[PDB]
Amino acid sequence: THTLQLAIGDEPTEGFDPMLGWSHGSYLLLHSPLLKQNEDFSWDSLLLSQYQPSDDGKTWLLTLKPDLKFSDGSPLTAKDVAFTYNNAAASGGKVDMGNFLSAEVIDPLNVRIHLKAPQSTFVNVLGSLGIVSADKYNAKTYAQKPIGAGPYRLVSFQPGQQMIVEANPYYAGNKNDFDKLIFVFLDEDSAFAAAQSGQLGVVRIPPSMAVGSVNNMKLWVRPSVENRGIVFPTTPAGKKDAHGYPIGNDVTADVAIRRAINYAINRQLLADQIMEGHAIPAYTGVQGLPWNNPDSAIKDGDIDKAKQILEQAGWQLNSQGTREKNGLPAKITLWYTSGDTTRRDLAQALRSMLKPIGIDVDLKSGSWETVERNMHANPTLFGWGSLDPMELYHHYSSNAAGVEYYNPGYYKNPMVDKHLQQALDAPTWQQAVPFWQQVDWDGTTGAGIRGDAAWAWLLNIQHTYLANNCVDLGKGTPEIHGSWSLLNSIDSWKWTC
Ligand code: NI
């Protein structure tokens, strides 16, 4: 051996076929999309010399670099790009191509993309869908023996065991200091055990584990979009959805409750106690992103402010020391998913933090199936996070209300809907950004704390790794909520010795 062994996620089952989407994170190892995001969130082109949307944002012009090749040496041209997009759309998978219509090849280095309607977020598709070879693609065969333009290529794959890959010599981006990589697939505990023993060069660890010194290893803290928040029902009770699930909560429908909970919680204390300080306070679902409203942050852990907000809206302390309004006491149930000690620790901590302002929080846990039934009538603990601004839409659009796990509190604000649609219809993502910011607050209304306060956002989680002292994991964009997020920086990895 003498090569780098890594433990950063679990088995890449199902396979490595870009036609099945970017839902998994391992694909970034063997494949490369047309675009690669920068740390300043602009876009670099690995395979493109030129890419330009039209004034209406309905068409894209793509120009390839001339001598590109696949991992097997076969040439990468317009034919393969157009094939990739047309067939990814034309199958499932059900890759969400959005408003994508079709891809036309102009010449071997040029491709024209056609859309149904303006989509400012389509760039996120360009930096996501991996390129596939038109000549050599077979649906069943490709998952097991894939051909890609990624930084590495498959050498061997041992199920439930390990994966061996080597550097792709035809890679169009930067080569790193590591010629060969072996990825080990282990449960967290055995992984940590192998890490201390110095068998591994890089290992992902949970931010919640009071990590002590590890022999001949160093701790890396990488930024992430992964977050934690509480979603409130915004409507009164009494109605039910298509599944017969109850909709609404007579307590959390009052905006004063949601604002008060937003101010009472001390997020820094959450980060330090539960996440061992490896988290950042989050006041929005898009904290740390360009499309976050710059005026969205608040000074929290203010019991007095919370009590003021509650008093001004008619929520008064009863004899039991619990808030009450028009004969209705503030007693609410917080739901969360079982199977995680940390989620529960977070929940109980929240109950304890809401006790001083007179809100009595009962806690219930269950399987996703169980949570689903109660998810619309009670406050609920969720984890999300995405590098696509589209998530704002999924959270706050009236059209997304009750759609799967999105917008379960049935939040509807027509002005917010307008800002959202304006944002989607913008010809470029840059022009879209100011409208995305208007969602929190436009000066009059919004979905944020200054406005309707649909959420109580708690934290943005950061990912933590142990790495051999001679290993430099470099730098990159915030890591996704998923496995193999570290791979987003893989090209900048260096060897310090
Ligand atoms: Ni055409």
Automatic annotation (TrEMBL):
Transmembrane segments: none
SUPFAM superfamilies from the UniProt entry: Periplasmic binding protein-like II
Gene Ontology biological process terms in this record: peptide transport
Keywords per UniProt: Signal, Transport
Disulfide linkage: C470-C497
One MF annotation (Gene Ontology) recorded for this entry: peptide transmembrane transporter activity
GO cellular component: ATP-binding cassette (ABC) transporter complex; outer membrane-bounded periplasmic space
Pfam family, one: SBP_bac_5
UniProt-listed PANTHER family: OLIGOPEPTIDE-BINDING PROTEIN APPA, PERIPLASMIC BINDING COMPONENT OF ABC TRANSPORTER
Protein family according to the UniProt entry: Belongs to the bacterial solute-binding protein 5 family.
Protein name: Solute-binding protein
Species name: Yersinia pestis
